[PDB]
């Protein structure tokens, strides 16, 4: 139970990025906090979990931190080689409304916010297909997201019975950083 979560076997495949394939049902360990399927649900899901007063607009802070992270990190992200756009053309697309966030955003955000993000993928049941972890923290301290369908992200909160640590939180400095991007 607690043993199970503590026994997750992560393999690092890319620097700072791991994968695992435990086989367990999301609903045995997590509450799924559903997010609207509007193309911004990656960032809704992160907001849900890092801003204790999240609304339907708070994702703007996460996207702005994604902009901040990109300016610092995109040029050196392996996955940016595949995305291929200049930083400027990428920001334009990434900041467009309803433009999905993905593994590249997760990678940069984990660095910008100094958090560990885990994406748990499922396909037509809630049994996990794979876990993908950005950052070196463990499941109890991570921002846990659920990815389902081809496209959709939801937030996951560890069930109270297993929750341990204090939680990751958008700092006040984060909101300042976020607002800074906006005005520039």
Swiss-Prot record:
Start and end residues of each stretch annotated as Essential for the vOTU enzymatic activity: 2-29
Domain spans labelled OTU: 30-159
Domain of life: Viruses
Result after altering residue 154 to A: 40-fold loss of proteolytic activity
Active-site residue numbers: 41 (for ubiquitin thioesterase activity), 152 (for ubiquitin thioesterase activity), 154 (for ubiquitin thioesterase activity)
UniProt effect for mutating residue 100 to A: Almost complete loss of OTU proteolytic activity
Consequence when changing residue 152 to A: Loss of deubiquitinating and deISGylase activities
Annotated domain remarks: The viral OTU domain (vOTU) and its N-terminal extension is responsible for ubiquitin and ISG15 binding and for the deubiquitination and deISGylation activities.
Family assignment from sequence similarity: Belongs to the Bunyavirales RNA polymerase family.
Other observations noted: Classified as His(+) endonuclease since it has a histidine upstream of the active site that coordinates the first cation.
Known partners and oligomeric status: Interacts (via N-terminus) with host ISG15 (via C-terminus); the deISGylase activity of the viral protein interferes with antiviral signaling pathways mediated by NF-kappaB and IRF signalings. Interacts with host ubiquitin.
Function summary: Displays RNA-directed RNA polymerase, deubiquitinating and deISGylase activities. RNA-dependent RNA polymerase is responsible for replication and transcription of the viral RNA genome. During transcription, synthesizes subgenomic RNAs and assures their capping by a cap-snatching mechanism, which involves the endonuclease activity cleaving the host capped pre-mRNAs. These short capped RNAs are then used as primers for viral transcription.
Name listed for the protein in its UniProt record: RNA-directed RNA polymerase L
Organism: Crimean-Congo hemorrhagic fever virus (strain Nigeria/IbAr10200/1970)
Lineage: Viruses, Riboviria, Orthornavirae, Negarnaviricota, Polyploviricotina
Originating gene: L
